[PDB]
Structures are given as structure tokens and as C-alpha cells.
Design a protein around this ligand. Sequence first.
Ligand SMILES: *[C@@H]1O[C@H](CO)[C@@H](O)[C@H](O)[C@H]1NC(C)=O
Length: 295
Amino acid sequence: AINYLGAGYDHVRGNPVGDPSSMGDPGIRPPVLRFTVLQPLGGYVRQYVACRQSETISELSNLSDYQNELSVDASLQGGDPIGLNSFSASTGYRDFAKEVSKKDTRTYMLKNYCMRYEAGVAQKWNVTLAFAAGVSQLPDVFDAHNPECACSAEQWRQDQNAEACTKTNVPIWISFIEQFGTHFLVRLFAGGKMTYQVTAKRSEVEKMRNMGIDVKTQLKMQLMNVQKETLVIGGRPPGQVSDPAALAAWADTVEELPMPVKFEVQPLYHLLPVEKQEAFKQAVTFYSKAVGLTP
Ligand SMILES: *[C@@H]1O[C@H](CO)[C@@H](O)[C@H](O)[C@H]1NC(C)=O
């Protein structure tokens, strides 16, 4: 329907569970690979007989659990996480940091996957016109790899338009990344996904444990006084994310407009010339250092 294979991905700004202003992962960037229901040359696309459904529930005790649950829907090829402060710039990451810093509450996350098709690539690929046209503008050397450097991660985050950074080539590299991301999708399951972030008081969870009913089972069956945030992937935006009819309608608009809900990616330096590969790796390290949040 819509080509998402080979699209760029910003793993710093990515968020494979959603964003209130975007109907897809905010890290998804325009397609980088050029290609030829109908199978492309060098890859494969398989359709599903139904909306393949799957549910997963997990308690998110800290930002590591949140980032790990996110890593299941956006990892490197082979299940291994991307790392390097993944998703640390996404809005849904700071919101969860704020909600978990309270530390008097337990947060759970439920995921309903409604996957409709699967796409992937085999083992040396054509790239789009704009991608090669932007790579041609890239130097062979990343300046900020030199630790003595006017432009640093903290300097770039404070003022990127400062003369210290404008003298270096760093703003060039960042622009490229800001346009194309840090990775590209080599495999993807597209369709729809509904994720609930549940925020409950520890007193009520103690009450549930006293009653004997399982907290996770009660949360799955219910979707017992909680705060609910709803994140949506795929289909058309519902003007009120918290309505039963909004759910019922978006679930059917998913088929019309599916979007990647669980994908495996590959670093972009595999697509760059060998001379620029190490410089680009340094550049993406600098990018994760400057935009990501280590403290
Ligand atoms: C794109 O790649 C295919 C094989 O992946 C190749 O056959 C084709 O020639 C390439 N495109 C052009 C315009 O040559």
C-alpha cells in the first residue's frame, strides 16, 4: 500500500509506541532505498489473511523497562537493541520519565498488535536520488571526533547556531541526520497498534493483591481506579483518543492505512562510502550524545 521498507529511522527521536502528534513512530524518516501483492526486486512482502492480533502486558518500574519494551518494536536486525540512548528525545519518553519520577505509583503497559502485512529485505542496494545527493555533500571527516573542538555535544545543544559550531562541519552532518535519521528499516510488520499506559496507586495494587485477583489479568480484562494514557499507531487520527467509538472506528481505519508496528533496522553507515563510514559513526555518536538524555 505505502512503502515503508528502507525508510530512515532516528533512533534518538524514535518512539515505536506512538506520539500524540504523529500517527507513526516519530523516528521514521523518508525512504532511503529505491525499489522496483507485487514483490519488489531484492526483498519480499507478505500479506496476512486477517489482522494478526497479539497482546503483551508488562510493568514498567523505571525508564530501563520502558526503553526495553520500546526496543521490542524497534531493535536491530536480530532482536538486539539499538542502544545509544534510544528514544531518549521522544515526547513519550520524557512524559514517562515525569510520570515515573513520582515513584509513589506503578505504571503498566499493555500492547494490542493488529498486524496486517510483513516486509523485508535479503542480503548492496540502490539508494534514492536525494539520499545519494545528500551523501555527496558529506565530508570524509567528522570534526567533533576531535575532543578539543569548538563544537561539542553540550555546546551544540546549548547553541547550535553559535560561531563555534558553524565553523566546524558538524551542522552539515546533523542536517543530514535530521533529514534522514541514523538507521534504516530492513524488516517491518505494519498494521495497527494500541498501547495503554496505566498509572495506579500502590495502595490500590496492594488492595488487589489482598483480594487475590491478578493485577495484570485485571488490567487486561478491564481494558481498579487508574489513570490511562492511550497511544495509537496506524490508521487515521481520532479527535479524542479516549472514547469507545474512537477505538471502534480507528480499529477499522487501520486496514485502510497500515503503518509499521514492529520493525528491525540497520545502521546507515552500511550505505555510505567506506571513507565516510567511520566519520558518520562518530557523527551519530555525537548526535545521540547531544540530543539524547544521559542524565
Ligand atoms: C536498481 O537495482 C537493481 C537490482 O537491485 C538493478 O537491477 C537496477 O539496474 C538498479 N537501478 C538502475 C536504474 O539501474
